[PDB]
């Protein structure tokens, strides 16, 4: 799997990520698309970044993990970009997604953040 995917993510954790975006969307604030997600991280407003595992070409999202580590922001992967798009509430695929305000999903976000900490 692609070289920008830095660690292995279990299906359960991956499902928790797609659920967290589902909730944070209507009850909080998210940003959807790679430019929006990237800005969020540079602006330091991203709480969690979710990156699709099937981005081609890689270069679309390849810069995110290093930029996240630079800004001290947690990131995690999900297998599908179409599925990540659906979660973001758009009818198109999304290569990456940022959570700016978690809303009714604060604890799930904090849970995700602490298990990817061991994987880092």
């Amino acid at each position: 799997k692609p070289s920008y995917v830095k660690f292995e993510v279990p299906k359960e954790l991956a499902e928790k990520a797609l659920q967290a975006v589902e909730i944070a969307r209507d009850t909080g604030k998210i940003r959807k698309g790679t430019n929006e997600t990237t800005k969020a991280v540079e602006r330091g407003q991203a709480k969690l970044v979710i990156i699709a595992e099937d981005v081609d070409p890689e270069e679309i999202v390849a810069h995110l993990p290093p930029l996240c580590e630079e800004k001290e922001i947690p990131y995690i992967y999900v297998p599908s970009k179409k599925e990540l798009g659906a979660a973001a509430g758009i009818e198109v695929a999304a290569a990456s997604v940022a959570i700016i305000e978690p809303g009714k999903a604060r604890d799930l976000v904090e849970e995700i953040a602490m298990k990817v900490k061991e994987l880092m």
Partner: protein, 53 residues
């Protein structure tokens, strides 16, 4: 863009899996490039990790 090619075979195809080698195909066109290149620095950090440099 619909044109794909197998990273193994080199075969051009419209399919997701190479009809020759059997490998997962990639989009044939290279990624878009900006002279401004906003994330070159961070892309370079990823690439340095990849290249053993």
């Amino acid at each position: 863009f619909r044109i794909r090619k197998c990273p193994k075979c080199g075969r051009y195809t419209l399919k997701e899996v190479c009809p020759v080698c059997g490998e997962k195909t990639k989009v044939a066109h290279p990624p878009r490039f900006s002279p401004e290149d906003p994330y070159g620095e961070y892309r370079r950090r990823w690439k340095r990790e990849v290249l053993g440099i």
